[PDB]
Amino acid sequence: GMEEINKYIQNSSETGGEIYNLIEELFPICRSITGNGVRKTMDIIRKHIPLEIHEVKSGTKVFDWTVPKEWNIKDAYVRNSKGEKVIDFKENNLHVMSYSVPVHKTMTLDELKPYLHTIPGNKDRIPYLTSYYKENWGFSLTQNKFDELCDDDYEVVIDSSLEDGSLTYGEYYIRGELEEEILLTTYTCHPSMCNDNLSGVALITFIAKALSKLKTKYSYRFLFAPETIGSITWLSRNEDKLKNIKMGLVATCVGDAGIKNYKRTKFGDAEIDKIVEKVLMHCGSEYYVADFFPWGSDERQFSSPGINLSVGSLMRSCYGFDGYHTSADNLCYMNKDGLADSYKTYLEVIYTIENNRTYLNLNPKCEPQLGKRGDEFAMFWVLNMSDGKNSLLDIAYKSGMEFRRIKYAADALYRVELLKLV
Amino acid sequence: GMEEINKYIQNSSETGGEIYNLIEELFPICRSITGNGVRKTMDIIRKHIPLEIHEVKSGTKVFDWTVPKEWNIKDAYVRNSKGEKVIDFKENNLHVMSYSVPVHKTMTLDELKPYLHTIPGNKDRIPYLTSYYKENWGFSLTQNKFDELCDDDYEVVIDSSLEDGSLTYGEYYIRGELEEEILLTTYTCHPSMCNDNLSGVALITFIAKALSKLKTKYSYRFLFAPETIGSITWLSRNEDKLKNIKMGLVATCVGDAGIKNYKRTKFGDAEIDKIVEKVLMHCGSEYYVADFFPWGSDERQFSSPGINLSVGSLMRSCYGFDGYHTSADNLCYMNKDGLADSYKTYLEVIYTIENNRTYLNLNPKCEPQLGKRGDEFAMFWVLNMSDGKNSLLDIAYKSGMEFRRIKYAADALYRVELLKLV
Amino acid sequence: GMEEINKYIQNSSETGGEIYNLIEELFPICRSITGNGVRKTMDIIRKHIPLEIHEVKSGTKVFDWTVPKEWNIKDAYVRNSKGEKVIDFKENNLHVMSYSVPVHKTMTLDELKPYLHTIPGNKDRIPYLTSYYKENWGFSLTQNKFDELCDDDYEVVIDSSLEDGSLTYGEYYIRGELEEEILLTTYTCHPSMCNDNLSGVALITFIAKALSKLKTKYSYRFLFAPETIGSITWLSRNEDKLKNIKMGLVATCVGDAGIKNYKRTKFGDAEIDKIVEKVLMHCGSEYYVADFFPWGSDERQFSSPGINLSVGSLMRSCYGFDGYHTSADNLCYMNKDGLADSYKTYLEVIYTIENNRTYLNLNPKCEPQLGKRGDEFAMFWVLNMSDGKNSLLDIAYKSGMEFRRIKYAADALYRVELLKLV
Ligand SMILES: [Cl-]
Ligand SMILES: [Cl-]
Ligand SMILES: [Cl-]
Ligand SMILES: [Cl-]
Ligand SMILES: [Cl-]
Ligand SMILES: [Cl-]
Ligand SMILES: [Zn+2]
Ligand SMILES: [Zn+2]
Ligand SMILES: [Zn+2]
């Protein structure tokens, strides 16, 4: 039934490629926490999955936060007297500080310098900067290109707008047999950078695309929203729905060649933590698990004391990686096998969530005479521990065995009627 | 009082020898899960301890199981045209597959070969095979002897019977001051092999023989029954008695030169687990402790969810050892010091079970002025932790001290009336 | 507020010197469990802090103990025929066994020898011996000096008295906002030895001296009493006060050049254990933590089952150190930086005890938009874990961060009204 997910896991190599192509299509667009770039991004996503798109008015109070003004940008450049655009937004949108106020000026190098940003230690990288909440403006460039700049009169143009508007977020909901809900979120505010965070956006899109085709026990909600402000906005508009969210994962940085990393929920041993660590344990690659900390991505909002949901984060090279928030986080930094593997892992997690049943041994008094009914070690564990209190995940953990081994053992026993679902 | 066990522990070397002699006497007899071999074995045991012998009719439903037909064997052989018994049951009863249907045939080597069994990797071993529940027949032989066999017409004789009869089990019960019961079980179905399982049979016999002579707090029951089918049969006939079984041990593989191994109860930290690991910890030899798993010996039946007793297994080289289920598990594989040591350890376990009291310090407000009443570190622990909630085993564990040190410290304090038994 | 303790911690080097000078002043006085030496010691202490001095009559029943006779000593010596005091109390009070009955005799070397005590393994040390509860007398001397002694007639004089009198103990109480009480005890019965225990006496004096000048939340009691008999006497006279003692520390051996050692309370994870281990963890030096054992110093009386308070012991080189109970434990064995460091650590412990508050995040629904109100990682932890159930110590532990970092983060949040004290 959910065994239908197996073909998706088996074709993950090909899907890693499709996930990459979506990243490549999204790459050039200038996202921020608001704006037409976010809207162009939602359009592209809706070529793959349905979404309901929400627009929350600037000035709307979302718990302690206020929905900001909307920002947009047509062009930006620093041009020299010889006419050459020595900095050009059209070449890389990381060249402009996100939320830059509009500017049109002539300035000398010395007057421009304070608004220029480089990375001296990596003379070839463009730094990514933002200024969402204090009015400001900036240009980023490589140190190497900075070092070649002259004393001169430069035309400085940032053709932007910062006006009351609205904040875009997208949402897709799959109704399962049950209202209990698994939440998968990712953030849409980063512009032309790949691991952080076109990888999460493209991954969650394809997970949604696969789940759409299956009959699930749980309901699944997929949130695409700007980081921090988006999740706060969503929570402020959905307090009624929180009681059903059983578990969740924030997807980001899921595309590079490195090993998988799992950040636990604030509780450390919630069902989702136990499920994800059990999948990693038996997956055959290296991985690393970290405890919760109240910074990083939107798991901070979901794990606030007043929200208090079980949300972790399954990543590859976690944010902080070398080149993050710079132009080094580009298309060639994406790895197809990495994307394939992250997608496969998420699907295995979902398969585990769905098939984590609890059973009662219908012949608890000594073992049954296996043979009256037509992997024996797994079976003996399932019979032995199915007192009504142990889940298959519990048995997989105590036995040290892989989850599917336990599951298939339980299937076989259920067929010969030695188990009742409870 | 139970201090009377000390002389038995001190004479364990001599007893290891007596335990060996019982093994040697039992060795030649052809046991199976039923049959006259089991009966001859119960006769020999009753030369040492009393037993009540039970016979359960073939076809009796014992929980999900059915008591099998009774199997017996007079002779078996493969004879060549020259008249030579190239396989001879009288030389080793491992040469016949247990429960072999009777056969009387002439066959060529090629027709015989499929019913012949060897161990290619150990060209000198006879494999032990059984076929309790599907009708069948087989001969085991060494690969080396197989390799010397000719194309020929062979007379093939297995003079056996497989008929409705009854299943034998033996039982000995010692009444203590209390009905709470310690259960010690071993299995009687293996033929001419020593570690698995004449060692458990001879050991438990001698433990019973020693306990018989002592005034015990607990009641003790000793079960001698075929593996699996015997324990299921016993449980099916004694549901009324299960509420009193406080703890138990299955004895097998207790006779070789290797280190001691303890398999825990399914609960992992039951009183018996804590007691056995505390004895091993301070015993002065190497040992290994394993967690429960629902296969191996009869602890699977006792640990079924519907029975759910605390039964572990104290062994030497656990089943799976090199040569197990083969003719290599012979008399020379038994080691007297091993048998002596296993017996000593079981007695120390029993001494601990019996003397694990709980006391109340009658002078809890500061330490007493020791000197008003005529190993001080042990004493201070006993006084300090005897609030009515801590057992001597608890104190031995927290103090890191050996159990007898704590016990004797508690004795001395009880004498000067600084402790109340509670 | 308690931030006023910071200047005392910052001036600890100078205070280590003052603590040393008190030790030096106290060093020559002949303390025992009773006597005028204890009284001279209380006089000197009262030059630094107020004390209430108690005198409990010999023969008074203090729980199971009896207050002993009072012992005093004017002079003691062994003199040879040539007139030379070959042993002289005036040179070192360790030369006389504490509680020595008075003696005035002429004896030959062979008759004297059984009452002489040396340390053969450290031919230059005077052993410290006592005989509080059986009547007796002895002289201690170096092996080297013993080896130079002649066959001779020696005048043997111990000018002492052992008569019904009273047992002295001193006590100082600081009333805090709350009656809940922190108890700091030290023992006054050791004569001319420094680490054991003029160091505890001088340290606790200076802690009392500093706390006296601060407005504390908790009440603080400082007990100066002979070991064992003194604490039992105090407990027997203050059962009514025990319900308020939240935590406590016994100070001894706090003056040498070695690393800090913490002995835990019998509970192992009481608030005081958690506080002291958290201070050590981040203090920047090596340390060692030990579990409770019911011997050593007065934590045995406080941790009796009938008293059952949370009292640990924060030391440097714990009793048992090389030279302990000998003349090697002298002034040069005291280290100023050691004394300074022990005092600083005790003050940091007290600062932690006082500032370990519990708060409620007043904006629990998602993080606040920090910026509406004017070390961010610490702050995010405090906001995230302040659900009303977590103390700052809890947050410091879970975050792995140093306690003051958490405290100051909590201060800042409290100021902008994002936290309620609960
Ligand atoms: Cl939808
Ligand atoms: Cl497995
Ligand atoms: Cl009987
Ligand atoms: Cl010990
Ligand atoms: Cl006072
Ligand atoms: Cl820190
Ligand atoms: Zn980022
Ligand atoms: Zn076997
Ligand atoms: Zn001492």
From Swiss-Prot, chains A, B, C:
Q: Where is this region: Aminopeptidase-like?
A: 2-56, 58-356
- Keyword annotations: Carbohydrate metabolism, Metal-binding, Zinc
- What does the record give as the function of this protein? The genomic context suggests a role in the biosynthesis of modified polysaccharides; this association with genes involved in carbohydrate metabolism is observed in several phylogenetically distinct taxa. Is not expected to have peptidase activity despite low similarity to aminopeptidases.
- Renumbered to this chain, region (Permutated winged helix-turn-helix) spans 357-422
According to UniProt, the name of this protein is: Putative polysaccharide biosynthesis protein with aminopeptidase-like domain
Q: Which organism is it from?
A: Clostridium acetobutylicum (strain ATCC 824 / DSM 792 / JCM 1419 / IAM 19013 / LMG 5710 / NBRC 13948 / NRRL B-527 / VKM B-1787 / 2291 / W)
Q: Which residues form a coiled coil?
A: none
**Which parts of the sequence bind Zn(2+)?**
190, 196, 325
